[PDB]
Amino acid sequence: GLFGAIAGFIENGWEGLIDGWYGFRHQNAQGEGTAADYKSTQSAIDCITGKLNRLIEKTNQQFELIDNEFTEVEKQIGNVINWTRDSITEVWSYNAELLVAMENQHTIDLADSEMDKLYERVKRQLRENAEEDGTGCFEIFHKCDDDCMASIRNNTYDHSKYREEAMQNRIQ
Amino acid sequence: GLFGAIAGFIENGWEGLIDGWYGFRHQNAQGEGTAADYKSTQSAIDCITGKLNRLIEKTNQQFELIDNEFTEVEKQIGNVINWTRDSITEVWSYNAELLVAMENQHTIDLADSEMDKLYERVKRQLRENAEEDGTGCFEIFHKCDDDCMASIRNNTYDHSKYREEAMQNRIQ
Amino acid sequence: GLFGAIAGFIENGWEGLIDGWYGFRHQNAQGEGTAADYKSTQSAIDCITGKLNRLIEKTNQQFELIDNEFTEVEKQIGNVINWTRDSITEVWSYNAELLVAMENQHTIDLADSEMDKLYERVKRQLRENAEEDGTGCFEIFHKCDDDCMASIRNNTYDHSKYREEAMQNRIQ
Amino acid sequence: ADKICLGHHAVSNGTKVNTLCERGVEVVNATETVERTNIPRICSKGKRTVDLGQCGLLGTITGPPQCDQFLEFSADLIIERREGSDVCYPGKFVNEEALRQILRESGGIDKEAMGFTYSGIRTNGATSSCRRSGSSFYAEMKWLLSNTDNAAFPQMTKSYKNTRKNPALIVWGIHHSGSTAEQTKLYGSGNKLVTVGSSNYQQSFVPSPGARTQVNGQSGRIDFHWLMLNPNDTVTFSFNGAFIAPDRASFLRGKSMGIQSGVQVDADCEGDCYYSGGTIISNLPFQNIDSRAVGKCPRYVKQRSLLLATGMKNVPEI
Amino acid sequence: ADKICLGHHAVSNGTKVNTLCERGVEVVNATETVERTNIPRICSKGKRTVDLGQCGLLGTITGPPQCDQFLEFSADLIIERREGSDVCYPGKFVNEEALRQILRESGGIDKEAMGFTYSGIRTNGATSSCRRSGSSFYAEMKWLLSNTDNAAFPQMTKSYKNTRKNPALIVWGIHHSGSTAEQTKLYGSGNKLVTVGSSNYQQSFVPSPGARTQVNGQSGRIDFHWLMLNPNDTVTFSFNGAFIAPDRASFLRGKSMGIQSGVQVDADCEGDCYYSGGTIISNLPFQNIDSRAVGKCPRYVKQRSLLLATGMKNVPEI
Amino acid sequence: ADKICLGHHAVSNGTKVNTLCERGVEVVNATETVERTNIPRICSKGKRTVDLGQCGLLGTITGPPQCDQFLEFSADLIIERREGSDVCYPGKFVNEEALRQILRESGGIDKEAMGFTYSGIRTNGATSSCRRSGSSFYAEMKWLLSNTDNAAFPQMTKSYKNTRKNPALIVWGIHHSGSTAEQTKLYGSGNKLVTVGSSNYQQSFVPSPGARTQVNGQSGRIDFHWLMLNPNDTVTFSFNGAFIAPDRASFLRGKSMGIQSGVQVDADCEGDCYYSGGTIISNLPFQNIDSRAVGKCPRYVKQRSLLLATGMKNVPEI
Numbered sequence A, B, C: 001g002l003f004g005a006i007a008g009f010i011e012n013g014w015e016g017l018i019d020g021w022y023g024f025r026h027q028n029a030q031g032e033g034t035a036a037d038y039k040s041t042q043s044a045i046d047c048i049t050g051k052l053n054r055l056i057e058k059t060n061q062q063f064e065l066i067d068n069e070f071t072e073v074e075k076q077i078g079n080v081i082n083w084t085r086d087s088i089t090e091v092w093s094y095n096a097e098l099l100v101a102m103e104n105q106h107t108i109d110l111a112d113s114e115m116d117k118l119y120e121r122v123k124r125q126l127r128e129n130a131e132e133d134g135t136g137c138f139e140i141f142h143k144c145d146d147d148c149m150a151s152i153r154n155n156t157y158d159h160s161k162y163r164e165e166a167m168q169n170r171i172q
Numbered sequence D, E, F: 001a002d003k004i005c006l007g008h009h010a011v012s013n014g015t016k017v018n019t020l021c022e023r024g025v026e027v028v029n030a031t032e033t034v035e036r037t038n039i040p041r042i043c044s045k046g047k048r049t050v051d052l053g054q055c056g057l058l059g060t061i062t063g064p065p066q067c068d069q070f071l072e073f074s075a076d077l078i079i080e081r082r083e084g085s086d087v088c089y090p091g092k093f094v095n096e097e098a099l100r101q102i103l104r105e106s107g108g109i110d111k112e113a114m115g116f117t118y119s120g121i122r123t124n125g126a127t128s129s130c131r132r133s134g135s136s137f138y139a140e141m142k143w144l145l146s147n148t149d150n151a152a153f154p155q156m157t158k159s160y161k162n163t164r165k166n167p168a169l170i171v172w173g174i175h176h177s178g179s180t181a182e183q184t185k186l187y188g189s190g191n192k193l194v195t196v197g198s199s200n201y202q203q204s205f206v207p208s209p210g211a212r213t214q215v216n217g218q219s220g221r222i223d224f225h226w227l228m229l230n231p232n233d234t235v236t237f238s239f240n241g242a243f244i245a246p247d248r249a250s251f252l253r254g255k256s257m258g259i260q261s262g263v264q265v266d267a268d269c270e271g272d273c274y275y276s277g278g279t280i281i282s283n284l285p286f287q288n289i290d291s292r293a294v295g296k297c298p299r300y301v302k303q304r305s306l307l308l309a310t311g312m313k314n315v316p317e318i
């Protein structure tokens, strides 16, 4: 992608995540923990299903026979018929090759943008209390237990409670 | 959009803005105020007009009659003519359906990118003097009157004048 | 582009860079220096060559004559042949004009995204030790010699060595 | 304690469009790209128009009594109506569609005499099915017939040479009598045969009497044949009976266009796309009116509406 | 000393697709958009099908002994086989392809008597090449022939008028004898000539005896001609010898579709796309099976496979 | 007081291209995607070429004195010139375009004798319009006269059976005299008639004397007819007068391609796209040279130039 998140500063994916496309992973004094996110997965799945519904359908127009395969027809008209059919086949072969590559290019960029947005939201939520490290994780400067991580995971984190301790820890 | 600004961290638009597409809204001790921006609106309008000029035009090739509607023609040639016309109609019906959706997809992403660029440009000139809040606007840590807001709007804000007071307010 | 880096907050390019598409330029107590980057140039060149290989090729279908230019043919069939040929020409003229504009639009956005990613990586590498200025340059708050700049260029730069001095310089 | 915020505009009611991955997205503006309206008249200003009434297109070469004022016409637009007929005596043309396609773009015709002269036989054969002020015939052809009832028709030959710098058009006819006694009465007993020759053409014809259904009160028939002549050649006719001789030759001039319609004509208008119900005036690239329009027209699609976005996504308050 | 990280999922092995600027990119999922499978049977449930065997499509108008059960059929789907023949006596039709195209969509035929009667001449001409229980002829035509060997054939005329509100179909035939002696033995000495007339039709025919190669043990030939009648007109035949007279006229009913195939028929199935090898059932927009399919079918492309992505880029561990 | 910066490269002058929402954007590179150059020669190496001069394509079957060296040729590329003619005595073929299309891809012809023999009548009819060293005729057909002036021509029959495993090509001719006196002088008084028969073919022909314009100093005409034969069938000719008899039959071999051009031939080249002015050698997907090229060619478009970007947007200093 051109957003530089998947195969960018995130080195690789996780094969243990089986209930979503994106998720969290936390480590504190008690131990490690894992979870999954819901909104971004829903957005990506909705886009994919929309594309599939738009694409998969056949025509409604009916065509009939214009030549015979048991007894041949006059040459001067059969040549014209063959020429026209061969002319149409090329256009119909070109269109599909264009369209498939177009959609394949669009999908990956959509997924990359979703991952980047998920990262940016969490970065904005934690202000002047955590520091970036460059590989997709944040380092917290205060003591955060399981309930605090749960509150972070669902947008109920109040930064005013821990501001003074985090600032004192960071400045010195 | 895939930049996550419109319908992203900005909750909704303003129905009172009638002289532009993007604008500011400021509040201080004296009162509230509103204005509008010029560059981004011009860019978006220019792109839209370019697309319209590119699209709206008809051909200059001339076609004539090959059949009759008062007295019919021989069957074996009328069948071929009807077959060819029906074949062409499908291609011309498919092309428009592709093109319209393509342009509709492009325009919204363009607008979202413009909004994000304006936000980032405004953010990059208040270094170490203002703090983000996550709903699309900033909190200033010093005393700013109408003239200071006006200088912020037209790119004439000097951060060295207020640095010490803002830093002292922020650290404690 | 819609990433706002080329012709955005970077005012203009350099005509003295002759061994790459992107590069650095440093100034310290000893003097000035210039270099070039390798990864982004390789990515852009790979994409361009992929597009060129995808496009430049001709068909593998054979066509023959159906009319004569020394002695004419019957009118009622020549009219049909001319009508069909004129119908096909319009489709083949429309397709190319669409495709060229498509690719031209995509390439510039790709280049802009590459430049933005290169900027963001270096910004993330230097944490809390340098400050942005808004024109594509960083200001360092400690003493950095040629070896430190060379380390910045090719990663393996440790921010823990200069943290205290940079923080003390910045805070006062 | 100061604050500055950023935002965008919005509207109360928007329009729904289609994107690559959704159907029914709401925006502030959209426009239309398919045409659905027309003008129920023929717009023709700045061009010369000829409105044939009861006269058929092919009649202008032979000249039945209903095509007396269109023998030499000049026009840029030709309009044909449904009630046009091109015969006063029962019969039909051969290879009519090609001739019609040739004539629709001729832009007019010009007539030139041939100069044939005859001795012995009669010339003024006439019928009651083509009446001007009595009994008459086609205005540009001659019915030869014989000297008297049950006589002999000498075998004759005639020739004509083109002189001008453009191809010419030649038309002749053959008569099939209604019985085997009328053929003897009008051209004498025996066998009949005609032959036509040129540089790139050699054909022979022979009549065939018989009884048929009555059309316009007659039982005989007339067949018309035509050919095109290069501007140095010569045409020779050799005949013994049952011949309808030509009198004048036709030359084309310029170019034009022809349509078939059923509405009236307006002289204060302007257009270039015609069909059988009026004119189409638009700049949009697509149309959904008719698939057999002629001129400089938009392309035909089977969809009824296709909207193009002209604004950002609409997010109303509350 | 607390830490939180973000990431995405991955799979062990993925699928390779093509993008705008690379070939062979690996993703988690993909699907197929080109059809390559069929059913080797004719699926027809909910429609009436007629499976002609040894009978040819054009025979149903004339009625050779192999088309005795298809004289008046009704169907929505018509199937023709490779072994079908439509002649019991050597001969062929004229302008056969147009008639076949007309009949393929008729949906059936209905027969109505004409009412011709003859006096003096014989009617029961029969041959040994069309055997039912002996020597017979076509079931819907009459071989006129003469009173006795080397006799006279009076010149006769017959007429028929359409009455219903739809066009009718008329078929007749001409006989070319195998020598110049058989012609005089069957219709007497002299010249022979027939003529056919209507409102928009007039033609003449004359036989031509001669020796040819032996097909089915015979040397003569029969030529069949046809015409279409508007629903108020009249048709007149004038003849003197060598005539095969019609006996009944045909009218169409409804509409249908016809195919040519070589497989069996299944009555528990559903489909709308047929070709010469079975039925194509799919919802994909493209196919790579046959280029001459009929019905409601996907379009034909010359590529074998085209994959569509359905997931993000795959980045496996280590 | 240390500083680092980032930037990109630029050039003094760039190229203008078109994007989705603007026209005339400046970049560092662009390339061309439409071909406009050719080679003014027929480039052909690695294939066998035959360059017919004054000989017409259809003459190689009959053999006028200008096609003596092309009676049995083998080639992969066939070139026809504007001055080619295929007649030494005035006349023309019937259904010529289909035969030309058949022969253009034949790849050569092979001749095999028939074996007809005649008794009584003469065989050495010759004319002064086809001169080799005096008065002669076509090299592969025979002109059957009568024994002496004003004599009788017996009615006779001939037959031929195909033996090989491929279809054969048969050609014959009919002679239309310039007057009745000439007909009675060359074939005697009375009526004349010929007939041709096979399994899937039966026709009759009759001459028609008359006076026409003089071409090459002659007034009569000759018409050529042809047919195709399956590899078991038999052809029978029955005739009494006015017959030009064939002498050899032709068989095809292989496949090839044919073009019409007006330039010379080069043997040191490689190409696969030909038109009437030379060769087109390119890998680009589009061309703007000719719309009637043959071979493996790029597609024709009406635009003159279309540029493709190959670099980033150009932002020069100051």
Ligand SMILES: *[C@@H]1O[C@H](CO)[C@@H](O[C@@H]2O[C@H](CO)[C@@H](O[C@@H]3O[C@H](CO)[C@@H](O)[C@H](O)[C@@H]3O)[C@H](O)[C@H]2NC(C)=O)[C@H](O)[C@H]1NC(C)=O
Pocket (backbone or CB within 6 Å): A068, A069, A075, A078, A079, A082
């Ligand atoms: C127009 O194109 C069609 C193909 O779509 C041509 O028909 C094909 O012609 C070839 C050459 O004869 C046929 O191949 C041979 O057919 C015979 C008869 O069945 C068979 O015995 C041979 O073993 C060989 O397969 C091919 O079947 C046939 N395709 C059909 C009938 O579907 C057609 O000839 C072209 N038009 C002209 C004027 O050439």
Ligand SMILES: *[C@@H]1O[C@H](CO)[C@@H](O[C@@H]2O[C@H](CO)[C@@H](O[C@@H]3O[C@H](CO)[C@@H](O)[C@H](O)[C@@H]3O)[C@H](O)[C@H]2NC(C)=O)[C@H](O)[C@H]1NC(C)=O
Pocket (backbone or CB within 6 Å): B068, B069, B075, B078, B079, B082
């Ligand atoms: C090729 O397609 C055209 C349609 O674009 C076919 O022409 C159409 O044929 C139908 C069936 O006869 C016509 O409908 C009928 O017209 C008569 C005449 O007014 C009317 O009385 C009936 O109630 C019915 O509406 C239709 O008008 C006609 N369209 C035209 C002439 O523009 C054509 O038949 C097709 N070709 C072949 C060989 O079938």
Ligand SMILES: *[C@@H]1O[C@H](CO)[C@@H](O[C@@H]2O[C@H](CO)[C@@H](O[C@@H]3O[C@H](CO)[C@@H](O)[C@H](O)[C@@H]3O)[C@H](O)[C@H]2NC(C)=O)[C@H](O)[C@H]1NC(C)=O
Pocket (backbone or CB within 6 Å): C068, C069, C075, C078, C079, C082
């Ligand atoms: C179908 O379109 C073709 C064009 O692709 C038409 O052929 C062209 O007809 C014009 C008009 O006669 C030719 O122009 C003139 O040709 C003569 C003969 O060489 C020349 O002496 C004049 O100076 C003038 O150039 C043109 O050459 C010819 N193009 C060819 C043969 O390639 C064709 O007439 C159209 N079909 C019908 C039925 O009109």
Ligand SMILES: Cc1cc(C)n2c(NC3CCCCC3)c(-c3ccnc(Cl)c3)nc2n1
Pocket (backbone or CB within 6 Å): A093, A094, A095, A097, A098, C054, C055, C057, C059, E302, E303, F285, F299
């Ligand atoms: C005149 C013309 C031009 C091109 C570029 N063409 C391609 N390349 C694809 C490149 C990507 C966009 C669609 C076309 C093909 C083609 C490609 C692959 N498979 C077949 Cl069967 C055909 N045929 C083409 N024809």
Ligand SMILES: Cc1cc(C)n2c(NC3CCCCC3)c(-c3ccnc(Cl)c3)nc2n1
Pocket (backbone or CB within 6 Å): A054, A055, A056, A057, A059, B093, B094, B097, B098, D302, D303, E285, E299
């Ligand atoms: C062979 C084929 C394949 C497809 C996918 N087709 C569509 N769907 C659109 C999906 C998005 C891209 C353009 C086409 C239609 C179509 C769609 C809407 N209205 C009509 Cl009238 C027709 N016809 C198609 N034909």
Ligand SMILES: Cc1cc(C)n2c(NC3CCCCC3)c(-c3ccnc(Cl)c3)nc2n1
Pocket (backbone or CB within 6 Å): B054, B055, B057, B059, C093, C094, C095, C097, C098, D285, D299, F302, F303
């Ligand atoms: C039915 C139709 C519709 C359009 C929009 N058309 C264009 N405009 C281009 C706009 C960009 C996309 C390709 C087409 C042309 C056209 C324009 C310029 N030069 C030529 Cl040679 C052709 N022909 C068109 N035909």
Ligand SMILES: *[C@@H]1O[C@H](CO)[C@@H](O)[C@H](O)[C@H]1NC(C)=O
Pocket (backbone or CB within 6 Å): A147, A150, A151, A154, A156
């Ligand atoms: C978010 O998670 C915390 C977990 O401690 C829970 O108490 C809180 O109710 C959750 N918020 C909402 C809106 O459910």
Ligand SMILES: *[C@@H]1O[C@H](CO)[C@@H](O)[C@H](O)[C@H]1NC(C)=O
Pocket (backbone or CB within 6 Å): B147, B148, B150, B151, B154, B156
């Ligand atoms: C920007 O606005 C301020 C208002 O305080 C004004 O003094 C200044 O001149 C403006 N700058 C420009 C370039 O217009």
Ligand SMILES: *[C@@H]1O[C@H](CO)[C@@H](O)[C@H](O)[C@H]1NC(C)=O
Pocket (backbone or CB within 6 Å): C147, C150, C151, C154, C155, C156
């Ligand atoms: C990066 O450059 C420095 C220059 O001082 C060098 O010492 C170091 O080895 C380089 N890193 C790698 C991985 O080569």
Ligand SMILES: *[C@@H]1O[C@H](CO)[C@@H](O)[C@H](O)[C@H]1NC(C)=O
Pocket (backbone or CB within 6 Å): D011, D028, D029, D030, D310
């Ligand atoms: C939408 O576009 C039309 C087209 O010009 C314009 O008249 C209208 O004012 C636009 N919408 C609004 C709300 O202005």
Ligand SMILES: *[C@@H]1O[C@H](CO)[C@@H](O)[C@H](O)[C@H]1NC(C)=O
Pocket (backbone or CB within 6 Å): E029, E030, E310
């Ligand atoms: C890939 O898509 C198919 C189609 O629904 C689905 O059955 C399959 O589960 C998907 N792949 C995986 C690994 O789930």
Ligand SMILES: *[C@@H]1O[C@H](CO)[C@@H](O)[C@H](O)[C@H]1NC(C)=O
Pocket (backbone or CB within 6 Å): E231, E232
């Ligand atoms: C047929 O012709 C007669 C007499 O011209 C007329 O009365 C009748 O209305 C016409 N139509 C039908 C359906 O009979």
Ligand SMILES: *[C@@H]1O[C@H](CO)[C@@H](O)[C@H](O)[C@H]1NC(C)=O
Pocket (backbone or CB within 6 Å): F011, F028, F029, F030, F310
């Ligand atoms: C532009 O591309 C061409 C194609 O190879 C190349 O020769 C040229 O060097 C490129 N432009 C520059 C300034 O190098």
Ligand SMILES: *[C@@H]1O[C@H](CO)[C@@H](O)[C@H](O)[C@H]1NC(C)=O
Pocket (backbone or CB within 6 Å): F231, F232
């Ligand atoms: C030709 O016909 C004969 C006799 O009917 C038959 O025996 C033979 O198999 C046929 N085919 C060939 C190639 O001889």
